[PDB]
Structure formats: structure tokens, C-alpha cells
């Protein structure tokens, strides 16, 4: 009897010219219950959303790379408490800088756990008001997509952190450091490890750091005016449907391009395979990608926040704590939109969004391409899906 | 389908020359589900691990002696709140020393509970940076194994504590004080009480403070460079497979040698009988060693830690609180390796380790001999076992 | 011995500074003075008579003294909100290190400007939540932009704390210079000329070179930039000519600033310093009354445990008054001084002090941007030790 | 006197004159060791605010290592 609020949210966003095209799917017990799409591939030609449409998922790369870390921990490659300097000595002797210009040596070693929890003290190029982000932009960490991960990390390693490892939380480039440390610890490339440990077993054939062979025609167009590497803006970018210029930050066909915090291309269908797996740690066939005990370890609330709560550039994530893979709902009474205790997932800067809701055996994903949305489409579709499932 | 991660962890430690020989067993519902061994008795001759191999379990002595205390409390010999001075007046008039050289009388009496929780204010010879450990080494408390417990306690009793009883936590010599107070309260020897109250009923024929008659040939060789009585090192001892010199701290055939905090010899099989009993407080036959209510009293979280957490010489025990017998997992979201809420146990300095996991009806023990390991083998095998049991 | 000469000649001999001049006066007459080195190391020309220096932040005490004069004359007062004179500063915002922006809960006043408690920052401020936007705006870099227009760009940026609640060395003296222009209807350079330079016979001090100044201008060395990405460690101390870009022109008849930009000479700066002992010219004409001079010099901002710091460099035992630093605890001082000693310094290593307990003034002139050697304080210590 | 003569000053980091004092560590009463967050200066030495201790210091987290080192005991060892 509840109407289809999902289609309504998405059709309105498209009809109000706020997003070009949107796809979504919600699965329960591993099968789709709701799905649809709205709009077009691009508003310039109005080509229809192709099948297996491809999206830059930006930071939805993080749960994937984090899960790989959990698999390697389970396999004994390293452990939560492993100092990353053991794998890359360039991260020995870190310094810490503060807002009063004072610099001093770090009082603790950065560990694998610090990376996964964004408590290592790293920042991000786009971070507004940050004591070190100016030096990240000068270094072109995000801007220079053509630079090999290994080389970007050498440049990052020379920069000071913005607090002592383990003592604070700040959403950061640390998942990129994780990807690198993974390469250091295993002797392998993070893209190959992903391919064989996660994508192949889950049949995510369209996911990777470059377009598939027939990928160009399926790539959704990206809009919006937010920059992830420019001088951080003092007020939100205006929400205008104008193609986004990604510069050289996000190549389509660079076989060496790989990152921990962004850069994957994927599809609604591929990302839903990953999300569904998170409900159990198994492939649909029943291969174990991660044991129940280490999955519990990965999902448990690990970082708790003060009254100010979890924030990124002052944007709130109300009632969310942080676990080893991303956000997790720890207080429905503090939540700003419909959810259930234990709901988890993450999202990407081009407005892609996903969640997993263990109390409903439910997963959801909204795919779209808008950089700097002033409308939280992801949270709106989640709310809509929540309202529709009892 | 999950592979045997236990054997893999252990074979790798042996093949990388990090440990000489390792045995492990994991029981569920009181029967072995996984077990194995790797390496040899000693690398000098490469003799194979004999059956019923014997290990110095060091601080895994503590849960045993603590459990005895709980049995005597149940029997009315003393109670948690009993001031120990009631049994040994040498512990009247304690003093407290601080890092600023200031000494003053203790403001509270040390109780049986303080001993079991390491909140009595005692320290340890090996304690780095401690306001009193220098005086413990001068006194040769750990070094002089040949000294009778009763006499060592008289010497210890004259020393100041490092905080007021009940006001802080510091892992200490207090289980040795407990063993002594047990002797004072009962008129009996702690080794005889152990033998008849615990070992005999559980058929632990190879456990005790001296080698059995046929014990010498079965004693595993001990390696490593950590000293438990020397000037505390400023950085970890290098991890080298070189036989360890125990001086006279750990005699093999001294019929009067007995301690509360270390000194037992045991076997994988004996220690597993003790661990399994902890799941219920009964022998396999069904004799009650400790009622459910006093077992609940012993296992409940009793000491809680600040953000710094539980630490020993600055080594962390993440997400662990302390109960009357040793560590207990109170927050899986703070844990640094795979576990379940309520998991408990302890470990010894020669890298022996055990756990009990009530949510899985599971016990595990890893036996090895390396003093000053820079690799946490115990936690690695636990993680491996966790990953293998759903 | 002549400690001042030993200190200067060793600096020159270790190739740390090209040329140095110093004079120390007592009771308005010289008691120590000298010079060492050369105008430039390239030609090894001797320091010319009446050599000219970029005094950078030694501009602030002069512009601040001008403000005190206007205050005495009723043009405005310490509590005057600057928004009254330039509405572009109505509705300020405050940004923090966590990206949070909110409206300022207090109005910026004249007093806030003089005490660097307004919440403004600086282009060169390392780790600062707003300095990146100052650099992008080219506030220091673009010397060719008229003061008035530059202020318009600055006024749109957030502060880094709520006016009156913290201290941070800042562009606020430039704002002061600008607010002076708004309040008086006159230019700050003309006001300075008329009210201060002429009465003190400071004929060589101004925002552009005199007709015969080109040959007198000391060469400037060092690699510190006041507008580039703030360095994570001090640049190497090497005598190489400094590139000033378009930040500090020599003959722009419109260049005027409050926080830097004056050219001066040792002799001229000493006349200004000597005047600060009394608020009068040598002939006895009053530039500022004793009561308002007392008001200007009294310790006004006090500091906590870290003390006064600029980009984390300490000013030990110093508090702040309306003109600059003032020694309030000799037992915390890092170099010889007396209670009440005051003055300021410039980024090219110029430095001056006034010591009322000894009727003493002193000034050290050199041109080195980014010195790793506190020459100013070394020379003050030497003079103090010679009395 | 040396300060007055310009040999060094109160704020001079001692590591400038003996690099063996570059990269100091700080130990606490809980066994935790971490790098020093500030450079020892001449002024720190004169005021006993450098973090050094003494062999005879009762209850001190580092004095046992001073005694083991024989810093006071071994009068025959050259200062350097």
C-alpha cells in the first residue's frame, strides 16, 4: 500500500533538472525488490541510460579496499596493530603540524588500524581550513591522477600529519596509504589483488580502475562544479547541471592508475553484488571471502564521536559512528533520516550512495554522477526505501 | 571450506626461524576440533617434539592460582574484601612511593580483591620506568627462584607500593602475594592445594612447580633474549632463536619452589583441561570445582580502562578489561584481533597463550618457548582459530 | 670590548649578512654606532651615506603611532567599530580548522586592529585555516593593487577567530591604515608625511624611493617568501638576492600599506624611536600627549604558557601593547633587556628597541629575508651589555 | 659570560653544538617512550627544564639507567 517513493524521489530530481540520470536497486535476502532508473546518460544528447551503465564511484572505493585489507589480515599478511613503517620506511619519523604553525615529531606509529579508521592524522587536498591541505594541493596528490600510487605515496610521506596517530578522527587520504601498504606487504598490485580476491569471485566484471573494452559508450556523464583538488570553497558550489571537468585526476584508460580512496569505475549491478556479500561475508555460491568473526570485527563500532558528531568539511553524519569499512548507525534517535541500528555503508563525491541494513537483510544503492550536489540524493533514496519495507 | 590457517601461521613461524617448536589445540564443546604442531623440541639437535611436551607457562600460572583463590572464597577461607594483613601482619603499614620521590602511608588496606585485580599497588622487577622496580631487582624478587615464597614475601613486604590500593591498575607481583596469603590463611602450601583442588580432579598429571620423574627429556627448550629481572630494556630485545639463560629464576627440580605469578610447568593437554573447565566450573565427569555463581563473579568485567586502555610496559590489550582471573573482551569494536564478546584467558612471557570463548563453547591454547617474542603468536593463532569456526 | 662590532663583523665574515648598520642613542644622542660589510656582495660597494632599507613590519609602529594621534584628535576611538567607516567589514565570518564557518559574534574595533585581536591572519601564516585564501587573493603578493581595492578583497574572507578573543599577528595594521583613510578622507602616506615624518625631519622615509634613492637602496638577500606556500622548515640561510616580485615596488606613487612597505634609513628610524621616549620632537613639539603615549605603551595583551608566538617563533617575556612588543618579565626574557623595553622588527631583519629605564634607543639595519640568526636581538643584547 | 660574548644564546639548541643530542626521547612512569617534541636549549640546561634527571633520583623513571651507565660513579671517564 505504501507507494513507490523511490521512483518519486528520483523522477523529481530528474524533472527539476538536478541530476541527469539515476539508477537504483534495493535487494532483500539477496534478490531485488525495488529498482528503476530516471533521466538519461547525458543531457547534451539525451541518450538513454545504456544497460550496465558505468559510474565513477569515487569514495565507494574505500569499503572495497578496506574489505581487501580485512581479507589480508585474516590471511596473516599483517594485523590491525602492524605499524605501516614496517612495510614502507618512508613513513618512519612522521611529523605533526597544528593550526598555530607548530611542528613536532609524532608520538605514535601509524598502524593498519589507524588507516582503516582515518585516525592516522592524514588529511585531504579538498579539506577546508586544514593546517596541511594547502601542501597536499601544492603536491597535487589528488590532481595528478597520472602519477603512480607508489610515487604519490613518497611525496605524501614527506608531509606532516594534522594530529598524533590514534588521537583524533579525520576523513582522509589514508585509504590510499592502505592500498599502497597493501602493495608493500604483499609484493602485488592492489588492482590485481582486488580483481582476484573480490571482483572475480563476485562476478563484478565491470569494476576496476579503467573502463572495460566496450566501456566508453556506457560511461555516464559527470556533472557539477565541486573540485576535489582546488582551493577549498568557502560556500558550496552552486548546483548546476554542467559537465564536470576532471582534469587528469580520473583517467579512463590508464593501466597503472590505482588508488585506495577513489578511482574505481563500477555498475549498479556490480556494486550491489559487493553490498549483498557484506551481509554475510560469502559469495552467492557460498565461497567465504571473509569469515563471520572477522566480518563482525570489521563492522563493529570502533570510532565514537562527541556531541559535534562525525563530520566531513563540517557536513554531519548524524547518529553514525565509524567501523573498519565506513559509517555505521549507532543511534537511531540521533539519525537525520530513516535507518535502523547497524545500518552501514559509505558513498562517493559524485553522489553515489549505498547501504546495508542487517536488521532487514537489505541492501540499496543509488548511482548517479554529480560532483558537489546540494541535495543529498543518497540519503533521500535510503529514507524512501526504509519507508517502503516495514 | 576455510583453510587451516592455524597450521599455516605455525608453519610460517617455524620456517622463518622465529620459533623452534609450536603445539596448539582448539576444543569445542570439550572435544578437539583443530590441533597440530610444528618444528622441533630444540634447534641444536632438532629432536622432534616429544609427546606430552612440557612448557614453562610463566604467567599462565596466574589464572590457575586465581581460580584456587575463588575456590577458597567459595569455601569461606576468606573473602574478596579480606584485608591481607589479617593473614600476614608484615603487610600492615604499607607505604606508597611516587615518581617525584615522595613517600607516604597507604590510605587503604590491601584486600584479596586488590590482589586478584592487580589494583593493590604492587609492581614487578621488569617494569620499565616504574618508581619502585629498581628496588625489586635489588631485592632479586624474580631473580632468586631458590628463595622460599614465604621469605621472598617478607622482603617484598618492606617495599612501598606505587599507588594507593584500589585506586589504579598495574600488572604486578600481586598473584605471588595471593599465593602466599593463601598459604597464610589455610596453613597449607599453595602447591599442595593446587595439586588436590585443581590438578588431581582435572587429571593434570604433568602440571606443577617441578618436572615430573620422566620430565627432563620432555622439557621444551626455551629461546629468546628478554630478561624478567634485568635492567628493563629501552627497546625490545631482538628476536633471535638463541637458548635463553634463566639463571636461578626457574628451577626444574626444587621441591620447595612455588609462586603465584609464574613458575608452573605444564603441557598442552593439561592446560586444555583447565581451560575447558572454565567454560562451566566442572570437571568432565561433573565434579563442581566452582559453582556457577562464583564463576560468574570471577569472570565478570571488574576493572575498566580509560582511552589508553589496558597496558603492560605500554603494550596494549585492546578492547580487554580485567576480571578476577585475567583478561576479558568487553568491546569487539576496540579489539585488535578476531574475538567475541566475553572471550577471556591470559598468557605467559615465553609466548604461551590460551583463551576461552563462551559464545562458541570454545577453548584454544598455543604452547611454545620464546622469551621476548616480537611476534604475537598467541593472538595470531586465536585470530586463525576464530576465522575457522564461523 | 665593542661587543656590537664583534657581533656585526662576525655575521659579515661568516657570509650571513651583506651589510649591517647600527646606532644606539642615550638621552637622544648617539653612544654607539657603526657599520660592517657592504651594500651588495655582487659589486662590494660600501654602505652608502644615508643607506635605504626595506623596513617591512617596522612600518607597524609608525602607522600605530599615527592611529594614536588620530585618536587623541577625536577622529575615532579604541572602541570604534571599523564597520562604521567601511561597511564592507559589516557581517564578518569566522572559520575554524575543522571547516566550520559561522558569523562573528563581535564587531572588529580599532583596538582589535592595533592589538592583532581582530581575527585577521596573514598570507605567510603556516597551518592557518584561512592563509591559503589570502595567497589565492594575492593580498601581499600584489603590491600594485591600491590599498583600498585590496581591502575589498580581504573583507570578504573569514577571520580565524571571534574579534577580541585571541591574538594572532596579522594584516590588521593594513586594515588600520585603510580605516584611517576612510575616517579622515585622506591618504595614509600624506597623513604620515604631515603628522610624523616632517615634524621629525624623516626626509628619507616613505613608500617610494626619493629621486636620488636608487643608488642608496641596500640589496636584499634571503629566500623566505612572505606570500608563497609557507615552508615546512626554514629555507637555508644563504646570501642570494631576494626576488620581491611585484610585492614591494620602489616607485609606485600609489603604493601604501600599514603592515609593511616603508623605505627608511637608520637615521630616520632613530628619530622616530627617540621620539617614543617622550612623544615629542627634539625641539619639544608634542606629537602625542604623555597620557595617550602611556595608554599606547601599557601592556595590553598578555599571553599564556606558550607565550607570544608568530609562526611558532617565540617572543620570550614579551607582552603586546598598541605599538608592538613590550618586555613584561625579564626573568622570562631570552636576551638582555629591561622591564618596559618596547619596539618591533621587520622580516628583512631590521630591528629596533626603546628602553625607557635607560633613556636608550637602538636600531639595527640589514636586508635579509628569512634569517636563521636573530641578529636584532644579538645586537640589543650587545648594547645592553655595554652600558 | 659566554652568552654575553656571543658564543651562544639562551635559545640555542644544544644539538647545534653536539648532534648526539639530536632526536631525544622521553620516557614516562608507565613505560611509554616517545620522541621529544621540543629541542633542548641552553636555557633549558640552566633552568633544569631540559628533562634530564640524576643517578640518585628516587622513584625516577630513568635514574636506574643512569646508575647502570655509571654516570656519576665513573669519575675517571672523560666528560666528553
mmCIF file of C-alpha atoms in Angstrom, chain A residues 6-293:
data_model
loop_
_atom_site.group_PDB
_atom_site.id
_atom_site.type_symbol
_atom_site.label_atom_id
_atom_site.label_comp_id
_atom_site.label_asym_id
_atom_site.label_seq_id
_atom_site.Cartn_x
_atom_site.Cartn_y
_atom_site.Cartn_z
ATOM 1 C CA UNK A 6 11.956 5.717 -4.654
ATOM 2 C CA UNK A 7 10.806 6.403 -8.203
ATOM 3 C CA UNK A 8 9.159 9.583 -6.971
ATOM 4 C CA UNK A 9 12.315 10.930 -5.362
ATOM 5 C CA UNK A 10 14.329 10.089 -8.497
ATOM 6 C CA UNK A 11 11.806 11.357 -11.059
ATOM 7 C CA UNK A 12 11.533 14.636 -9.166
ATOM 8 C CA UNK A 13 15.311 15.089 -9.071
ATOM 9 C CA UNK A 14 15.439 14.491 -12.829
ATOM 10 C CA UNK A 15 12.382 16.672 -13.666
ATOM 11 C CA UNK A 16 13.745 19.538 -11.541
ATOM 12 C CA UNK A 17 16.923 19.350 -13.639
ATOM 13 C CA UNK A 18 19.047 18.469 -10.610
ATOM 14 C CA UNK A 19 20.504 15.183 -11.888
ATOM 15 C CA UNK A 20 20.931 13.905 -15.482
ATOM 16 C CA UNK A 21 20.277 10.230 -14.835
ATOM 17 C CA UNK A 22 19.769 7.989 -11.831
ATOM 18 C CA UNK A 23 19.665 4.230 -11.293
ATOM 19 C CA UNK A 24 18.830 2.448 -8.051
ATOM 20 C CA UNK A 25 18.219 -1.025 -6.734
ATOM 21 C CA UNK A 26 17.230 -2.378 -3.349
ATOM 22 C CA UNK A 27 17.728 -6.077 -2.602
ATOM 23 C CA UNK A 28 16.324 -8.097 0.272
ATOM 24 C CA UNK A 29 17.573 -11.582 1.063
ATOM 25 C CA UNK A 30 19.830 -11.181 -1.969
ATOM 26 C CA UNK A 31 17.108 -10.533 -4.567
ATOM 27 C CA UNK A 32 15.898 -7.247 -5.987
ATOM 28 C CA UNK A 33 12.644 -5.922 -4.507
ATOM 29 C CA UNK A 34 12.755 -2.386 -5.933
ATOM 30 C CA UNK A 35 14.700 -0.921 -8.858
ATOM 31 C CA UNK A 36 14.364 1.683 -11.563
ATOM 32 C CA UNK A 37 16.062 4.495 -13.377
ATOM 33 C CA UNK A 38 15.256 8.051 -14.326
ATOM 34 C CA UNK A 39 16.667 10.532 -16.817
ATOM 35 C CA UNK A 40 19.341 9.901 -19.421
ATOM 36 C CA UNK A 41 23.063 9.180 -19.862
ATOM 37 C CA UNK A 42 23.767 12.859 -20.723
ATOM 38 C CA UNK A 43 21.555 15.947 -21.169
ATOM 39 C CA UNK A 44 23.545 17.215 -24.148
ATOM 40 C CA UNK A 45 22.323 14.435 -26.495
ATOM 41 C CA UNK A 46 19.715 12.922 -24.158
ATOM 42 C CA UNK A 47 20.973 9.451 -24.989
ATOM 43 C CA UNK A 48 19.153 6.881 -22.815
ATOM 44 C CA UNK A 49 20.851 5.202 -19.865
ATOM 45 C CA UNK A 50 22.590 2.262 -21.502
ATOM 46 C CA UNK A 51 22.441 -1.134 -19.866
ATOM 47 C CA UNK A 52 25.319 -1.815 -17.448
ATOM 48 C CA UNK A 53 25.774 1.924 -17.220
ATOM 49 C CA UNK A 54 29.182 2.748 -15.712
ATOM 50 C CA UNK A 55 29.811 5.231 -12.876
ATOM 51 C CA UNK A 56 32.808 6.788 -11.178
ATOM 52 C CA UNK A 57 32.049 5.675 -7.612
ATOM 53 C CA UNK A 58 34.725 7.849 -6.021
ATOM 54 C CA UNK A 59 34.904 7.091 -2.263
ATOM 55 C CA UNK A 60 32.743 3.994 -2.529
ATOM 56 C CA UNK A 61 36.159 2.665 -3.485
ATOM 57 C CA UNK A 62 37.011 2.746 0.244
ATOM 58 C CA UNK A 63 34.758 -0.049 1.540
ATOM 59 C CA UNK A 64 36.103 -2.266 -1.238
ATOM 60 C CA UNK A 65 39.772 -1.601 -0.484
ATOM 61 C CA UNK A 66 39.041 -1.814 3.279
ATOM 62 C CA UNK A 67 37.429 -5.226 2.824
ATOM 63 C CA UNK A 68 40.538 -6.378 0.944
ATOM 64 C CA UNK A 69 42.621 -5.263 3.946
ATOM 65 C CA UNK A 70 40.366 -7.379 6.198
ATOM 66 C CA UNK A 71 40.931 -10.407 3.910
ATOM 67 C CA UNK A 72 44.709 -9.945 4.102
ATOM 68 C CA UNK A 73 44.554 -9.573 7.906
ATOM 69 C CA UNK A 74 42.568 -12.821 8.037
ATOM 70 C CA UNK A 75 45.274 -14.420 5.829
ATOM 71 C CA UNK A 76 48.132 -13.234 8.110
ATOM 72 C CA UNK A 77 49.713 -10.691 5.767
ATOM 73 C CA UNK A 78 49.519 -8.052 8.517
ATOM 74 C CA UNK A 79 47.378 -7.164 11.521
ATOM 75 C CA UNK A 80 45.412 -4.193 12.824
ATOM 76 C CA UNK A 81 48.335 -3.212 15.103
ATOM 77 C CA UNK A 82 51.030 -3.502 12.372
ATOM 78 C CA UNK A 83 52.994 -0.247 12.096
ATOM 79 C CA UNK A 84 52.910 0.737 8.427
ATOM 80 C CA UNK A 85 56.545 1.816 8.604
ATOM 81 C CA UNK A 86 57.372 -1.939 8.761
ATOM 82 C CA UNK A 87 56.259 -2.141 5.135
ATOM 83 C CA UNK A 88 57.336 1.270 3.947
ATOM 84 C CA UNK A 89 60.179 3.034 5.833
ATOM 85 C CA UNK A 90 59.266 6.291 4.104
ATOM 86 C CA UNK A 91 56.595 6.501 6.836
ATOM 87 C CA UNK A 92 59.144 6.334 9.663
ATOM 88 C CA UNK A 93 59.589 9.614 11.507
ATOM 89 C CA UNK A 94 56.297 11.340 10.866
ATOM 90 C CA UNK A 95 55.763 14.934 11.996
ATOM 91 C CA UNK A 96 52.605 16.588 13.220
ATOM 92 C CA UNK A 97 51.623 20.139 12.366
ATOM 93 C CA UNK A 98 48.985 22.271 14.137
ATOM 94 C CA UNK A 99 46.916 25.416 13.325
ATOM 95 C CA UNK A 100 49.407 27.582 15.265
ATOM 96 C CA UNK A 101 52.263 26.662 12.910
ATOM 97 C CA UNK A 102 53.910 24.409 15.488
ATOM 98 C CA UNK A 103 55.516 21.190 14.153
ATOM 99 C CA UNK A 104 56.744 18.268 16.277
ATOM 100 C CA UNK A 105 57.501 14.552 15.898
ATOM 101 C CA UNK A 106 54.606 12.054 16.022
ATOM 102 C CA UNK A 107 54.313 10.357 19.438
ATOM 103 C CA UNK A 108 52.919 7.118 17.978
ATOM 104 C CA UNK A 109 53.473 4.900 14.961
ATOM 105 C CA UNK A 110 50.722 4.827 12.324
ATOM 106 C CA UNK A 111 49.157 1.352 12.169
ATOM 107 C CA UNK A 112 46.939 -0.525 9.728
ATOM 108 C CA UNK A 113 44.044 0.124 12.143
ATOM 109 C CA UNK A 114 44.724 3.891 12.126
ATOM 110 C CA UNK A 115 44.452 3.873 8.314
ATOM 111 C CA UNK A 116 41.152 1.959 8.280
ATOM 112 C CA UNK A 117 39.640 4.289 10.905
ATOM 113 C CA UNK A 118 41.000 7.556 9.474
ATOM 114 C CA UNK A 119 42.764 8.129 12.804
ATOM 115 C CA UNK A 120 46.264 8.192 11.334
ATOM 116 C CA UNK A 121 46.378 12.007 11.117
ATOM 117 C CA UNK A 122 46.300 12.245 7.318
ATOM 118 C CA UNK A 123 44.145 14.884 5.674
ATOM 119 C CA UNK A 124 42.892 15.509 2.118
ATOM 120 C CA UNK A 125 43.523 18.108 -0.617
ATOM 121 C CA UNK A 126 39.939 19.395 -0.502
ATOM 122 C CA UNK A 127 39.852 19.780 3.266
ATOM 123 C CA UNK A 128 38.716 23.351 4.121
ATOM 124 C CA UNK A 129 40.624 25.184 6.839
ATOM 125 C CA UNK A 130 43.074 22.321 7.377
ATOM 126 C CA UNK A 131 46.620 23.046 8.661
ATOM 127 C CA UNK A 132 48.149 20.898 5.890
ATOM 128 C CA UNK A 133 45.746 20.611 2.933
ATOM 129 C CA UNK A 134 47.480 23.542 1.216
ATOM 130 C CA UNK A 135 50.598 21.393 0.945
ATOM 131 C CA UNK A 136 48.554 18.452 -0.450
ATOM 132 C CA UNK A 137 47.293 20.679 -3.295
ATOM 133 C CA UNK A 138 50.755 22.019 -3.937
ATOM 134 C CA UNK A 139 51.868 18.385 -4.109
ATOM 135 C CA UNK A 140 48.939 17.675 -6.460
ATOM 136 C CA UNK A 141 48.083 14.468 -4.606
ATOM 137 C CA UNK A 142 44.525 14.215 -5.976
ATOM 138 C CA UNK A 143 45.062 16.350 -9.057
ATOM 139 C CA UNK A 144 47.856 14.220 -10.571
ATOM 140 C CA UNK A 145 45.951 11.033 -11.377
ATOM 141 C CA UNK A 146 48.618 10.056 -13.897
ATOM 142 C CA UNK A 147 51.167 9.649 -11.099
ATOM 143 C CA UNK A 148 51.766 6.059 -9.937
ATOM 144 C CA UNK A 149 50.406 5.278 -6.447
ATOM 145 C CA UNK A 150 53.900 4.345 -5.279
ATOM 146 C CA UNK A 151 55.314 7.745 -6.280
ATOM 147 C CA UNK A 152 52.365 9.750 -4.878
ATOM 148 C CA UNK A 153 52.915 7.985 -1.553
ATOM 149 C CA UNK A 154 56.601 9.024 -1.444
ATOM 150 C CA UNK A 155 55.531 12.663 -1.812
ATOM 151 C CA UNK A 156 52.720 12.319 0.779
ATOM 152 C CA UNK A 157 55.114 10.611 3.216
ATOM 153 C CA UNK A 158 57.245 13.774 3.478
ATOM 154 C CA UNK A 159 54.283 15.823 4.724
ATOM 155 C CA UNK A 160 53.247 16.297 8.392
ATOM 156 C CA UNK A 161 50.050 14.841 9.814
ATOM 157 C CA UNK A 162 47.463 17.100 11.460
ATOM 158 C CA UNK A 163 47.322 15.185 14.754
ATOM 159 C CA UNK A 164 49.121 12.349 16.529
ATOM 160 C CA UNK A 165 48.138 8.928 15.200
ATOM 161 C CA UNK A 166 45.220 7.385 17.129
ATOM 162 C CA UNK A 167 44.190 10.569 18.934
ATOM 163 C CA UNK A 168 41.558 12.035 16.584
ATOM 164 C CA UNK A 169 39.398 11.266 13.545
ATOM 165 C CA UNK A 170 39.587 12.978 10.199
ATOM 166 C CA UNK A 171 38.349 11.612 6.888
ATOM 167 C CA UNK A 172 41.468 11.394 4.795
ATOM 168 C CA UNK A 173 43.807 10.027 2.143
ATOM 169 C CA UNK A 174 44.629 7.139 4.496
ATOM 170 C CA UNK A 175 42.770 4.531 2.391
ATOM 171 C CA UNK A 176 45.205 5.426 -0.388
ATOM 172 C CA UNK A 177 48.016 4.817 2.081
ATOM 173 C CA UNK A 178 46.340 1.487 2.921
ATOM 174 C CA UNK A 179 46.269 0.450 -0.788
ATOM 175 C CA UNK A 180 49.988 1.254 -1.022
ATOM 176 C CA UNK A 181 50.893 -0.550 2.219
ATOM 177 C CA UNK A 182 48.956 -3.496 0.896
ATOM 178 C CA UNK A 183 51.184 -3.414 -2.203
ATOM 179 C CA UNK A 184 54.249 -3.114 0.039
ATOM 180 C CA UNK A 185 53.246 -6.011 2.285
ATOM 181 C CA UNK A 186 52.273 -8.458 -0.461
ATOM 182 C CA UNK A 187 54.625 -7.686 -3.368
ATOM 183 C CA UNK A 188 51.496 -7.408 -5.544
ATOM 184 C CA UNK A 189 49.392 -4.626 -7.103
ATOM 185 C CA UNK A 190 46.218 -3.577 -5.321
ATOM 186 C CA UNK A 191 44.254 -3.746 -8.595
ATOM 187 C CA UNK A 192 45.316 -7.372 -9.170
ATOM 188 C CA UNK A 193 44.545 -8.306 -5.571
ATOM 189 C CA UNK A 194 41.100 -6.725 -5.884
ATOM 190 C CA UNK A 195 40.431 -8.424 -9.219
ATOM 191 C CA UNK A 196 41.205 -11.895 -7.923
ATOM 192 C CA UNK A 197 40.149 -11.729 -4.248
ATOM 193 C CA UNK A 198 36.930 -9.744 -4.671
ATOM 194 C CA UNK A 199 35.720 -8.869 -8.202
ATOM 195 C CA UNK A 200 36.266 -12.268 -9.871
ATOM 196 C CA UNK A 201 34.700 -14.231 -7.028
ATOM 197 C CA UNK A 202 31.670 -11.905 -7.006
ATOM 198 C CA UNK A 203 31.413 -11.675 -10.809
ATOM 199 C CA UNK A 204 31.962 -7.884 -10.827
ATOM 200 C CA UNK A 205 33.230 -7.865 -14.453
ATOM 201 C CA UNK A 206 32.765 -4.132 -14.932
ATOM 202 C CA UNK A 207 34.573 -2.894 -11.842
ATOM 203 C CA UNK A 208 38.164 -1.672 -11.962
ATOM 204 C CA UNK A 209 40.368 1.418 -12.299
ATOM 205 C CA UNK A 210 39.921 1.651 -16.096
ATOM 206 C CA UNK A 211 36.966 1.251 -18.493
ATOM 207 C CA UNK A 212 36.267 -2.219 -19.864
ATOM 208 C CA UNK A 213 36.870 -2.782 -23.588
ATOM 209 C CA UNK A 214 33.302 -1.706 -24.513
ATOM 210 C CA UNK A 215 33.206 0.841 -21.675
ATOM 211 C CA UNK A 216 33.355 4.266 -23.273
ATOM 212 C CA UNK A 217 29.815 4.141 -24.676
ATOM 213 C CA UNK A 218 28.458 3.095 -21.264
ATOM 214 C CA UNK A 219 30.217 5.654 -19.103
ATOM 215 C CA UNK A 220 27.671 8.037 -17.555
ATOM 216 C CA UNK A 221 28.421 11.734 -17.944
ATOM 217 C CA UNK A 222 29.524 13.584 -14.821
ATOM 218 C CA UNK A 223 28.111 16.994 -13.869
ATOM 219 C CA UNK A 224 28.622 19.562 -11.151
ATOM 220 C CA UNK A 225 31.108 22.188 -10.052
ATOM 221 C CA UNK A 226 32.779 20.753 -6.891
ATOM 222 C CA UNK A 227 36.555 20.410 -7.149
ATOM 223 C CA UNK A 228 38.363 17.777 -5.087
ATOM 224 C CA UNK A 229 41.775 19.438 -5.567
ATOM 225 C CA UNK A 230 41.170 23.199 -5.992
ATOM 226 C CA UNK A 231 41.287 25.858 -3.267
ATOM 227 C CA UNK A 232 38.532 24.698 -0.914
ATOM 228 C CA UNK A 233 35.386 26.793 -1.473
ATOM 229 C CA UNK A 234 34.019 28.963 1.348
ATOM 230 C CA UNK A 235 30.448 28.164 0.376
ATOM 231 C CA UNK A 236 29.004 25.213 -1.513
ATOM 232 C CA UNK A 237 29.431 25.082 -5.261
ATOM 233 C CA UNK A 238 26.194 26.119 -6.977
ATOM 234 C CA UNK A 239 24.110 23.083 -8.059
ATOM 235 C CA UNK A 240 24.115 23.380 -11.863
ATOM 236 C CA UNK A 241 23.861 20.581 -14.464
ATOM 237 C CA UNK A 242 27.064 21.422 -16.337
ATOM 238 C CA UNK A 243 29.547 18.704 -17.325
ATOM 239 C CA UNK A 244 32.366 18.466 -14.770
ATOM 240 C CA UNK A 245 35.999 18.875 -15.786
ATOM 241 C CA UNK A 246 38.006 16.137 -14.011
ATOM 242 C CA UNK A 247 41.374 17.305 -15.407
ATOM 243 C CA UNK A 248 43.821 14.424 -15.194
ATOM 244 C CA UNK A 249 42.606 13.192 -11.786
ATOM 245 C CA UNK A 250 40.457 10.312 -13.088
ATOM 246 C CA UNK A 251 41.780 8.704 -16.289
ATOM 247 C CA UNK A 252 39.535 6.267 -18.206
ATOM 248 C CA UNK A 253 42.230 4.135 -19.825
ATOM 249 C CA UNK A 254 45.395 4.239 -17.685
ATOM 250 C CA UNK A 255 46.529 0.704 -16.944
ATOM 251 C CA UNK A 256 48.689 1.769 -13.978
ATOM 252 C CA UNK A 257 46.108 4.067 -12.345
ATOM 253 C CA UNK A 258 45.049 2.638 -8.973
ATOM 254 C CA UNK A 259 44.087 4.280 -5.622
ATOM 255 C CA UNK A 260 42.620 3.403 -2.216
ATOM 256 C CA UNK A 261 40.174 6.277 -1.666
ATOM 257 C CA UNK A 262 38.628 6.806 -5.127
ATOM 258 C CA UNK A 263 39.113 5.932 -8.788
ATOM 259 C CA UNK A 264 37.063 2.785 -9.339
ATOM 260 C CA UNK A 265 34.517 2.523 -12.111
ATOM 261 C CA UNK A 266 31.599 0.223 -11.438
ATOM 262 C CA UNK A 267 27.963 -0.513 -12.203
ATOM 263 C CA UNK A 268 24.785 -0.588 -10.150
ATOM 264 C CA UNK A 269 24.757 -4.362 -10.611
ATOM 265 C CA UNK A 270 28.399 -4.861 -9.631
ATOM 266 C CA UNK A 271 28.187 -2.663 -6.553
ATOM 267 C CA UNK A 272 25.042 -4.497 -5.427
ATOM 268 C CA UNK A 273 26.960 -7.820 -5.574
ATOM 269 C CA UNK A 274 29.562 -6.331 -3.204
ATOM 270 C CA UNK A 275 26.933 -4.858 -0.854
ATOM 271 C CA UNK A 276 24.970 -8.144 -0.672
ATOM 272 C CA UNK A 277 28.156 -10.041 0.163
ATOM 273 C CA UNK A 278 28.644 -7.706 3.165
ATOM 274 C CA UNK A 279 25.531 -9.224 4.784
ATOM 275 C CA UNK A 280 27.388 -12.493 5.258
ATOM 276 C CA UNK A 281 30.982 -12.394 4.006
ATOM 277 C CA UNK A 282 30.108 -15.015 1.341
ATOM 278 C CA UNK A 283 29.586 -15.114 -2.425
ATOM 279 C CA UNK A 284 26.104 -16.178 -3.519
ATOM 280 C CA UNK A 285 27.513 -19.636 -4.336
ATOM 281 C CA UNK A 286 28.825 -19.805 -0.760
ATOM 282 C CA UNK A 287 32.554 -19.157 -1.111
ATOM 283 C CA UNK A 288 33.822 -17.397 2.023
ATOM 284 C CA UNK A 289 35.522 -14.106 1.224
ATOM 285 C CA UNK A 290 35.730 -13.189 4.940
ATOM 286 C CA UNK A 291 34.860 -15.316 7.995
ATOM 287 C CA UNK A 292 31.949 -14.250 10.250
ATOM 288 C CA UNK A 293 34.325 -13.407 13.067
#
